[PDB]
Paper text:
Previous studies showed that proper introduction of disulfide bonds could stabilize the flexible region of target proteins and reduce the conformational entropy by locking the protein into single desired conformation. The theoretical and experimental results both indicated that with relatively lower values of conformational entropy, proteins would be more stable and readily crystallized to higher diffraction resolution.
The continued disulfide omitted electron densities of the side chains suggested that the disulfide bonds are successfully formed in all crystallized mutants, which are T9C-A36C, A20C-Q25C, V16C-A29C, and K27C-A79C in BRIL and N14C-C93, A43C-L74C, and C102-R125C in Flavodoxin, respectively. The WT and disulfide engineered Flavodoxin structures were determined to high-resolution of 1.20–1.55 Å with B-factors in the range of 16.15–19.24 Å2. On the other hand, the V16C-A29C and A20C-Q25C in BRIL, the N14C-C93 and A43C-L74C in Flavodoxin have higher entropy than that of WT counterparts, consistent with their relatively lower diffraction resolutions.
Numbering used by the authors: 1 to 148
Amino acid sequence: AAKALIVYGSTTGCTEYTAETIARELADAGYEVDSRDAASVEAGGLFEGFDLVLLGCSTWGDDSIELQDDFIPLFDSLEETGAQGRKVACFGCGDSSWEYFCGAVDAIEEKLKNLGAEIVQDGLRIDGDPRAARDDIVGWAHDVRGAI
Ligand SMILES: Cc1cc2nc3c(=O)[nH]c(=O)nc-3n(C[C@H](O)[C@H](O)[C@H](O)COP(=O)(O)O)c2cc1C
């Protein structure tokens, strides 16, 4: 009955597997889940019709914090997605060898807050292998549902 959208930007598959794991948790709890690669979406009205939106994005950049490339157009047009009043939470893969660990998650959360979204949980930051972190991912999904 409640509808969740998960949109992920992933280049090596880490954030995509994380998104799949979240989608299964939410669907087992009774949500209808639509999980979309950011490469396939357009920003205008993207969040319309959804009760919960989860945004996943890995972090990149040779010497600066950059978002995963398929997520950049969505971030640049986040003001047109329908985020005002929307229950959101963010997740992403990264590598703690880097100073700005999952820094894309911070950038997306900051812009969502300016846009009036309701961030329902602190962002999930996956370091290294996501299958190794599966219990952390499922637990975070449970906590997001519990904060609605
Ligand atoms: C050039 C480069 C820069 C990166 N910069 C960061 C970074 O600043 N912070 C971070 O947490 N991870 C950084 N990473 C690591 C990745 O985000 C990590 O490999 C991640 O697992 C990719 O997730 P994805 O498969 O979902 O795209 C960097 C990786 C590369 C190759």
